[PDB]
Amino acid sequence: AQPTASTVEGLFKPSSAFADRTDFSLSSILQKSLINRESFNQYLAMRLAPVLRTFYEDNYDTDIKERLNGFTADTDNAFVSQEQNLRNQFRENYLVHLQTDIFDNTGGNQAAWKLRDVNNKIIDDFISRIFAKNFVEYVQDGVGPLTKPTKSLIENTSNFKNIKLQPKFVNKNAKLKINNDAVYAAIQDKLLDQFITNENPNLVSRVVFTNETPVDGFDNYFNTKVIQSPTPSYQFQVFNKYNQQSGGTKGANGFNLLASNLKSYKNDQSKGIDIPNKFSSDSGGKLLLKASDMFDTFDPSFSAAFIQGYLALQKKSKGADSKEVDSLIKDKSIIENFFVDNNTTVHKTDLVKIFGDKDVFAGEYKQQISKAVVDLIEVKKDSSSQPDYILSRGKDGIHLMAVDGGSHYLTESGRDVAKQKKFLLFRALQTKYGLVDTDTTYDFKLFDEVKKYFDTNRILFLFEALLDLSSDTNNKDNFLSYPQFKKFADSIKSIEKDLKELVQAHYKQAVFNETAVAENKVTLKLAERNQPFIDNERNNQIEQNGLAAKLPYEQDAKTGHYNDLGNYYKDIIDNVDKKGNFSEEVVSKLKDNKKKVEEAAKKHVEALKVFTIPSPLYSQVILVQTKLSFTPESTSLGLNLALNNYLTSTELQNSIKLSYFQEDEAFKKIIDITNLTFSQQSGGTGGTNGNNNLTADNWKIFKETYLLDLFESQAQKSIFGHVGIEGVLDTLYSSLNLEERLDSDDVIDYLSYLYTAHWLLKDNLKNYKQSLQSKLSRTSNAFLVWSVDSEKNKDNNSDITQTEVKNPNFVFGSSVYDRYGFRGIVTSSTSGSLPEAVSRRLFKQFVNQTNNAYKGALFSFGSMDNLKNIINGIQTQTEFDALYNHLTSDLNIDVTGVDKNKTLTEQKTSLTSFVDSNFKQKDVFSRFDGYIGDNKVEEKNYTSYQFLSDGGKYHATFVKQVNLDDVEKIGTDSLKQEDSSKDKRLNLSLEEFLAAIALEALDPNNQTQAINALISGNKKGLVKVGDFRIFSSISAQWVRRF
């Protein structure tokens, strides 16, 4: 089957270089690919599974020996099937697509496919067999581990040292068929420790008393006249009071059976805390609150309360009240514990002051709630002791939680990961032999949890575990010293000097990435939980809150981060740092490790001596190769796979777009693209001369406008802190880690906006003039509007349009507890951002029926003869219809003698005659620069301005008039700092003009035009690509084939 010539001519032609820039060379593209997490893991698979091939090779078991032969046979059969189906599908040109859509993604060779699928099969099998057995044991000396250790033997802190995750019949000095378990128990105890290290997986024994529908009746608690038809939930939380007659063990009865003897559920020998299942409404028991999905799989009020207990052990918990076990309110309902004293810290929801002079509660709630209200309190055995039990109410009722072993492996110095691993191994041993108490059930499988967390990094984590295994030369009891695994442990030894410098950094940064991702969920989900209690206050439904209480956790005004809740993850990044506020520490140690990955990847690619192999027949990729590696073929294919992932990735596309910015010398004079810092600092480097004459602060406002446009699109706007907005904006900017991520969408969009802002600023605003001309019109007034919403209407003459509206629409939380308004040049056709009230007052009700009220109405024409030159310019009937309606229904100018029945000539003739005979010079053509509301006044006379009124709300609006008589007048002298040149920029100041230009730059049409200018205005032309994976990845608007 000779392939047809059409596809052969039409297929991509591989070249010597991937692209034609100084950052797209082999030594740079391979380094960047090895820094890409997904690409790096695709490489590590091919550099890690050759290590695990040796274990299958020297293994005693006949089955494991035959696994390699079976994998090769299955690979041959799969190749036969692939060839058969490709032939039956493509016929004439099947070989071309066999090399194109299969081999290129695989390594570019027939044997490349077999070295991919076999090398993945063996690593998958080795991954499965690590966790195929349970090895948590209490090891006795001279008889081996006891088949069933006794309860009193293992439930001791001093006896934790004997729970070491060791196999049963493994002898170092013997060739045992099942000696391979000595491998897994060594790797598992490594992987498990990673699980103990990164996830910080504390166990919590918790009891939840679900929300109770009150048989007493909600009217007793929450009156219907204010709260109609309550439903059992957090906001209306009620439990039937404790009665001794009914023989119940849940609700207040369960809380009485529980809190009376609360001190007796901590097994002080084991330091663990075990609370009975029957005392909880659900199945009850213990849950694993690891760092990753504890704010995902469970309620935020639950996970955050567990964190509060976590730091309560470590004397780091803040904001919560403390009361002893004996002080618990068990006779009354449970909620009475939370009505804490108000007289004079602890963050208490004083609902008496919150609801003001409105009756929201009734009966016992009204009498109690005076007395503040909280959500979480700390209950402890003794006044001198530290809080071991935490009581908090969430979505599904009130939970009493206690971390078990917290006094053991969590102290003021931080988390003790060795003790934590020992304690969780003790719990896993408890579950292994059914040695738990009869009144509790262990829904706790540590091996399943470590397997599920480790399976995310199925390649990096296993490789790092092996490296740390071979990094411990002082421990002779590992499987490395077993003579059965002498060469296998040598294979792990042949990968330290080569890759470990890179893999340690990659692991230490990926774990930090996951830790930052998980700790972002803290401030994300706490805000999500607090969202309805802000919605209620927004909708004037504050009374719906009822029993809603603010959590004790403090937030950062300057950062928008929960510091104490971040300590739970700081106790992770302080552990992965030693391997080999949390916000500041992680932001420092992510860049200090990203530079380490840069260095390690560059050294690894250097030491590999990478050269480009010529591509095979019908190939469309630029493959690479190496020879300075322990297994040259697998390392070459690993680099091939890492490239196949990076070239198709959006990181390389954003790198190409980054290079297009690199080329533009005009833009690079004002920015430092790699540094993402505005250039020229502050001085005379190019200052002052034409061609975008402005400072570097003059670009900070463009950046701030971009940040505000991004902030307005945020799903939640309180995850970034609060007061004003100049701080929240830089916090949002930091949150993007743009300088740490130069090959992201978040940076190409930022730079696209920045060159949109410059492409309106260059050539003496040659494109800003065009945008304004195509936006403005002569028959419609245009304004620069500073419109603020005043919920209250009016020397006590402070301007309200220049006073910052902190927390507008309650966007930075709630106020009661814990020159602005600019819209740019807004016209009638584009008045979406303006409120309908002010937009109608400007572009449809300029001169209201209630003098200077006509000033600026026909300023859209600017001069006397201008509207005369436009009225006779009408050719058709509808063209005059629009003008007449605008002059009457919009510009409210009285018309005399006009007739609809007139012909085309007389139609315009009557209007021209009446315009001339009515305006034979009321400052109608003057420029209106002042306040518009219920009345109209100038800027100077703010003492006589009536705010616009609409639907009970008020508006304060400043408008500066803009016509085409100043759109054309912006030119070379438009960016000068001088005040006398303000007429050269729409009679604006420089800052106002640049803010308007930035708002114009946010236009998608402006950005598209400026980006096409960037690509077309390239000194070297469009970037060429020699690899198809770089051509298909990014559109032809940026890259061209050779």
Curated annotation (Swiss-Prot):
Topology versus the membrane: Lipid-anchor
One Gene Ontology cellular component: plasma membrane
Domain of life from the UniProt record: Bacteria
One of the Pfam families matching this protein, by short name: DUF3713
Compartments, record wording: Cell membrane
Record's keyword terms, sorted: Cell membrane, Lipoprotein, Membrane, Palmitate, Signal
Family note: Belongs to the MG307/MG309/MG338 family.
Name the UniProt record assigns to this protein: Uncharacterized lipoprotein MG309 homolog
Originating species: Mycoplasma pneumoniae (strain ATCC 29342 / M129 / Subtype 1)
